[PDB]
């Protein structure tokens, strides 16, 4: 049980503000090469956050939240599973317990979500299937927490178009999350719209990976079962020249199958 190594010059400037709020010891623990210290820092921070009394000044509560979110964000990228899992436990406590306990605003909730969800989505492209599932399940869990659901933030990340050079795992995970949360949250108040969903799905039909294109077809057909006529403007016209692309054939005779 030797002490954590010192922070590098780069880490020092990067974590400058967190050091003032949380102290150098805890930040050094979080940055060091010993996973059990990285884990302990997050669990210690978890204890510290919930022991802060109700009447604590709002600016101290917000600073502490912002410094903690800074550490959660880096720990979501951890190379050891236990540290990754401890960061999710901390993140959940901040959004679901700390914020409502101290009656903090929607801007704080939004800050937690905006700083962590994009980094968490990168972990849904991990090589480990068990890690992809843990990351995806947590995103689904946060998307349905009452305070986060109201902000409509998470659906907006899930409809962002798939990059050309995107991995097979990353693309499949995003599509899986889109389909599952679209069914749970629906259209209107959620942040999903016929507009952004179809825009995403039609764009995915040009992806290099067969399985990505195939899932886009499945989502388009599901949107036709629900919304019928209002999605047709997003697609090309139904005729035999369009049907010389094999995917659009499947879609349009798919539409024909769904009707009489």
Numbering used by the authors: 414 to 673
The authors write:
To this end, we purified recombinant human Cep104 TOG and subjected it to size-exclusion chromatography coupled with multi-angle light scattering (SEC-MALS) in the presence or absence of tubulin. The results shown in Figure 1D and Table 1 demonstrate that Cep104 TOG is indeed a tubulin-binding domain and suggest a probable 1:1 complex between both proteins. To gain a structural insight into the Cep104-tubulin interaction, we determined the high-resolution structure of the TOG domain to a resolution of 2.3 Å by X-ray crystallography. Characteristic for TOG domains, the Cep104 TOG structure consists of six HEAT-like repeats A–F and globally superposes well with other known TOG structures (root-mean-square deviation [rmsd] 3–3.5 Å, Figure S2C). Repeats A–C and E of the Cep104 TOG domain are canonical, whereas repeats D and F are partly distorted. A structure comparison of Cep104 TOG with the TOG domains from XMAP215 and CLASP proteins shows that the conformation of the loops that define their tubulin-binding interface is more conserved than those of the loops found on the opposite side. Furthermore, the residues on that side of the Cep104 TOG domain are highly conserved across different species. Structure superposition of the human Cep104 TOG domain with the Stu2 TOG1 domain in complex with tubulin suggest that key residues implicated in the Stu2-tubulin interaction (Ayaz et al., 2012) are conserved, such as the W448, V493, and R626 residues. To test whether these residues are indeed crucial for tubulin binding, we introduced point mutations in Cep104 TOG, produced the corresponding recombinant proteins, and subjected them to SEC-MALS in the presence or absence of tubulin. The results shown in Figure 1D and Table 1 demonstrate that these mutants are indeed severely (V493D and R626A) or mildly (W448A) impaired in their ability to interact with tubulin. Thus, the Cep104 TOG domain engages tubulin in a similar way to the Stu2 TOG1 domain. Tubulin-binding TOG domains, e.g., in the XMAP215 family of MAPs, act to stabilize microtubules through facilitating tubulin addition to microtubule ends, and we speculate that the TOG domain in Cep104 has an analogous role.
Cep104 is a key factor involved in cilia formation and length regulation that rides on the ends of elongating and shrinking cilia. It is mutated in Joubert syndrome, a genetically heterogeneous ciliopathy. Here we provide structural and biochemical data that Cep104 contains a tubulin-binding TOG (tumor overexpressed gene) domain and a novel C2HC zinc finger array. We have structurally characterized two of these domains, a central tubulin-binding TOG (tumor overexpressed gene) domain and a C-terminal domain consisting of an array of four Zn fingers (ZNF domain).
